[PDB]
Symmetry: C2
Subunit: 46 residues, 2 copies
Amino acid sequence: HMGHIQIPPGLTELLQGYTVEVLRQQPPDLVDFAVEYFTRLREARR
Amino acid sequence: HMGHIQIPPGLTELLQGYTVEVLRQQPPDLVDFAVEYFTRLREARR
């Protein structure tokens, strides 16, 4: 190890997406939406 | 309407949680984790 600060990148990126979707799509429920959005990202990257 | 800036609160809060879980739990896959985490929040609040 090198120190106590080594957050892996890629997270701030995927999170920013949710900010652009929830702000535009404006779904009725974010909880269920958070599941469909991520659950779909698992079957998208091909 | 009042203007073009009215983001609903509650989002920055739920997102902060993921930051504390992914940083501690440190799961092997964030995509699948994002689904189990949110999918569980729908059956937690009782």
